[PDB]
Amino acid sequence: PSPAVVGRSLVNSFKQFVSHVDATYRLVLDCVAAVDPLMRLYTFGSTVVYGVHEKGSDVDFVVLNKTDVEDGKGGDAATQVAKGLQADILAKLARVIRQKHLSWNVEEVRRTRVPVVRVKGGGAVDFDITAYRRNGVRNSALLRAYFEQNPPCRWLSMSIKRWSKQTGLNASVIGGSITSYGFNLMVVYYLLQRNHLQFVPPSTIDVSRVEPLPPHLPLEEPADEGLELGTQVLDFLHFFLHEFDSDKQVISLNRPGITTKEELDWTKSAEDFARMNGEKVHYQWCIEDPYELNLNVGRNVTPLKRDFLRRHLEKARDTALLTIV
Numbered sequence: 049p050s051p052a053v054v055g056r057s058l059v060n061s062f063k064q065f066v067s068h069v070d071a072t073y074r075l076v077l078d079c080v081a082a083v084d085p086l087m088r089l090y091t092f093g094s095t096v097v098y099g100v101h102e103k104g105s106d107v108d109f110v111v112l113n114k115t116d117v118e119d120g121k122g123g124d125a126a127t128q129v130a131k132g133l134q135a136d137i138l139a140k141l142a143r144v145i146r147q148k149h150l151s152w153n154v155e156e157v158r159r160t161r162v163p164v165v166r167v168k169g170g171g172a173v174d175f176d177i178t179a180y181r182r183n184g185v186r187n188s189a190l191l192r193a194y195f196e197q198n199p200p201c202r203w204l205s206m207s208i209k210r211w212s213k214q215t216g217l218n219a220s221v222i223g224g225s226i227t228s229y230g231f232n233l234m235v236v237y238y239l240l241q242r243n244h245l246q247f248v249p250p251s252t253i254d255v256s257r258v259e260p261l262p263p264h265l266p267l268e269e270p271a272d273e274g275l276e277l278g279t280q281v282l283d284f285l286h287f288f289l290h291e292f293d294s295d296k297q298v299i300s301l302n303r304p305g306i307t308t309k310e311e312l313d314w315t316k317s318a319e320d321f322a323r324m325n326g327e328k329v330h331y332q333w334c335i336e337d338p339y340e341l342n343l344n345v346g347r348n349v350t351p352l353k354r355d356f357l358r359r360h361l362e363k364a365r366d367t368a369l370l371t372i373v
């Protein structure tokens with residue numbers, strides 16, 4: 049199918065979408081304050097990246113102390129005491145949330161690299177809360193700043209996120225390998241490679257200068273019937289099938305141009321040595337996190353999952369991202 053054909057199907061799939069977070073922010077701050085009236089609440093993830101809250105997305109929150117915010121560019125400790133501190137505050141908050149909302153499922157999730165409290169309330173009211181960490185707010189502000197440069201590119205990212213959840217590529221599905229955040233990094237990397245975006249050094253993002261709850265950023269339908277959308281989608285798929293060399297290169301926002309696996313030591317010798325979360329890291333599909341030290345966002349992409357990804361990338365061309373029936 050042509051770009052126009054693809055663009056039409058896609059604009060056609062979001063028509064229901066085009067036809068809010070304040071109060072949830074406040075409900076959560078009611079809980080945070082009950083634990084500690086000096087603790088701040090910051091928002092991040094898709095709500096922040098896009099400036100729009102999608103149906104079927106959660107909200108990401110983090111609790112910060114005043115001194116965490118003032119150290120606006122500090123890194124996050126990856127130590128066992130940092131994690132102990134985060135668990136301790138989150139336990140307390142979790143207990144307050146259950147008190148104040150008897151009907152919510154409040155899960156203290158301990159599977160993970162970062163301690164998290166996952167709350168499902170029923171009114172499709174879904175959110176993750178973490179503590180004492182800037183990196184989530186910084187990476188979302190970074191991505192936001194990129195999409196603020198070229199607002200219509202959010203439709204490419206939004207199209208790629210939905211497709212990834214529908215094909216089982218997205219980590220939110222059983223067998224999935226790459227988070228939504230991972231996909232965003234890929235979209236922006238691609239856009240940078242094609243000059244649809246101007247490079248932003250990750251170090252220039254300062255948490256002491258971000259909004260706890262950033263303003264909404266209007267999203268308008270593609271007015272060209274989606275020609276540019278459809279063109280961007282096919283080019284994105286071509287790029288990641290035929291241009292990006294997954295054997296030699298890293299999807300990275302830390303520098304403009306090419307980052308190699310060799311300069312990071314993201315090699316077969318490193319996999320033998322390299323563990324994370326208590327399991328193997330893979331370096332088959334490499335996505336450098338712009339803030340965390342030595343973190344491959346594609347660490348779960350085994351050779352099999354890398355196979356699955358390529359196949360779905362190939363297949364997405366003919367079906368316009370699963371939109372042609």
Ligand SMILES: Nc1ncnc2c1ncn2[C@@H]1O[C@H](COP(=O)(O)OP(=O)(O)OP(=O)(O)O)[C@@H](O)[C@H]1O
Nearest residue numbers: 093094105106108183184187188227228229230345
């Ligand atoms: N693979 C990963 N490695 C490290 N950090 C991650 C990873 N995936 C997500 N995160 C963190 O979680 C935050 C939110 O990520 P998430 O995958 O939920 O993306 P999202 O854009 O909020 O999309 P969704 O609509 O799926 O919620 C990110 O800012 C990032 O800090």
Ligand SMILES: [Mg+2]
Nearest residue numbers: 093094106108
């Ligand atoms: Mg999210």
Ligand SMILES: [Mg+2]
Nearest residue numbers: 106176227228
């Ligand atoms: Mg998530």
